[PDB]
């Protein structure tokens, strides 16, 4: 992906994190586990929701064909009518299919971005109090108990304290 | 002691297309195209259609003897006519501005 996180330096996703799209896995002396970053997650849900509704709604006004019939000596206008109706269908078929392709690409990249930013958010807190392992993980120099871990997820990790 | 960042995966086999890549497996997707129908002509919002069966609009309106079924039809939602109804003008001829009248019927 464009942002290098998903299926990049973070090799794979987690079956074990059920509760959100992005989050944290911690590991210390007390144990280990997954925790979803809800805010980053809810941001993503709001964006994708708005997108789908924007797509659906933009295609709201669109060509509706009507039945018109013509006799044996009105072939020209019958042909005109047919070419006209087919023409609009092809145009709207193109618009729909292309919008879906373009916005699918942007949706996948958007998730990649949200992961990258979450990783950097944590990196920028920890700074040189941890080893950046290069796989999505940070190994602490000090012991980091569950309250310490929570402060990382918080945005509250007190750097001068360690 | 460590903290790791990661993302969701699941057992999904749903696929989507993009400009640069086709058949990308994603964790979730939303189909937006209806592909199925019931194969029947139905009441529209409870209001039954006028099904002319073997009669045409001309046979109906002029009162072709074979089209007595439609001697006094109730309110309809839409009208259904075959491609080549057999009971059209029993006595051969023309119907002047037939198409302009059929258009009038759609209102």
């Amino acid at each position: 992906g464009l942002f290098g996180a998903i299926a990049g330096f973070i090799e794979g996703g987690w079956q074990g994190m059920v509760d959100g799209w992005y989050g944290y896995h911690h590991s210390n002396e007390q144990g280990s586990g997954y925790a979803a970053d809800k805010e980053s997650t809810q941001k993503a849900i709001d964006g994708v929701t708005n997108k789908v509704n924007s797509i659906i709604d933009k295609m709201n006004t669109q060509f509706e064909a009507v039945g018109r019939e013509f006799n044996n000596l009105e072939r020209r206008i019958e042909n005109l009518n047919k070419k006209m109706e087919d023409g609009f269908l092809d145009v709207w078929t193109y618009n729909a299919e292309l919008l879906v392709l373009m916005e699918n690409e942007r949706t996948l990249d958007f998730h990649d971005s949200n992961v990258k930013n979450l990783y950097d958010k944590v990196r920028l807190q920890l700074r040189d109090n941890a080893k950046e392992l290069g796989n999505g993980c940070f190994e602490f120099y000090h012991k980091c108990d569950n309250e310490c871990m929570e402060s990382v997820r918080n945005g509250t990790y007190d750097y001068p304290q360690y | 002691d460590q903290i790791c960042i990661g993302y969701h995966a699941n057992n999904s086999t749903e696929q989507v297309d993009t400009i640069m890549e086709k058949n990308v497996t994603v964790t979730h997707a939303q189909d937006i195209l209806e592909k199925t129908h019931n194969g029947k002509l139905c009441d529209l919002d409870g209001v039954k259609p006028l099904i002319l069966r073997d009669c045409s609009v001309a046979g109906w309106l002029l009162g072709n003897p074979m089209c007595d079924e439609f001697i006094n039809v109730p309110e309809w939602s839409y009208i259904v006519e075959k491609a080549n109804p057999v009971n059209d003008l029993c006595y051969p001829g023309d119907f002047n501005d037939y198409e302009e009248l059929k258009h009038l019927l759609s209102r």
Epitope: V18, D19, W21, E39, T41, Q42 | N11, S12, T27, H28
Partner: antibody, heavy 128, light 101 residues
């Protein structure tokens, strides 16, 4: 429709173990579109989520911080049920215990912890 | 999760609005339950504004930032209950709705 049928004794002596079971019908304990939870309610504490188990290419459990050291929630894939075990009970564990399914309803495939089905409840009294 | 008011009385047919103020604003993770005496809670609203299975149209939900609202457009006698909001694993304290007659 899914039904959840609870059982287990409603009387536990102080310091001993509370043991409840939720038997599922209409769904699988190991379903990828289910999470199996225990929640309790008391007039004092209100509604409190205790823990859960779920299967996603392997079994997972999460437990509430308040009970983590005392609690176990195990699936039984022979009988399609899941249990609650709560050790070293005190009077503060007196409550109505409910099992409930979550993650059946999801926003874009993400479990939101919305609990769509609940069992009938077991009233548990801690007393000698 | 803080609900307001802790209880209310209203007449049959009244419009009733209950509020839940949340520590963190997530529209998708907030739900409303209705609990009648002696019964388990039943899911009423999910993801701020979707009606739960079997829930009548007089019940609706809205969300703005950290403020969430449950509205009963026309109160019925059978809507006597305690209503709880929920984000993640946290429940509000509940609002008791009593009928006024």
């Amino acid at each position: 429709q899914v039904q959840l049928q609870q059982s287990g004794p409603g009387l536990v002596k102080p310091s001993q173990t509370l043991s409840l079971t939720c038997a599922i019908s209409g769904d699988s304990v190991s379903s990828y579109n289910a999470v199996w939870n225990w929640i309790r309610q008391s007039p004092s504490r209100g509604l409190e989520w205790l823990g859960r188990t779920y299967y996603r290419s392997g079994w997972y459990n999460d437990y509430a911080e308040s009970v983590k050291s005392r609690i176990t929630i195990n699936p039984d894939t022979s009988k399609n049920q899941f249990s609650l075990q709560l050790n070293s009970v005190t009077p503060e564990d007196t409550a109505v215990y409910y099992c409930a399914r979550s993650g059946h309803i999801t926003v874009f495939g993400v479990n939101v912890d919305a609990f769509d089905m609940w069992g009938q409840g077991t009233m548990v009294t801690v007393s000698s | 999760m803080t609900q307001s008011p802790s209880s209310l009385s209203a007449s049959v047919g009244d419009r009733v609005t209950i509020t839940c103020r949340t520590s963190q604003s997530l529209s998708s993770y907030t739900h409303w339950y209705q609990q009648k005496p002696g019964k388990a809670p039943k899911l009423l609203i999910y993801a701020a504004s979707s009606r739960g299975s079997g829930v009548p149209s007089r019940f609706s939900g809205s969300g703005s930032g950290t403020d969430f609202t449950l509205t009963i457009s026309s109160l019925q006698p059978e809507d006597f209950a305690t209503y709880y909001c929920q984000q993640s694993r946290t429940f509000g304290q509940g609002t008791k709705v009593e009928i006024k007659r």
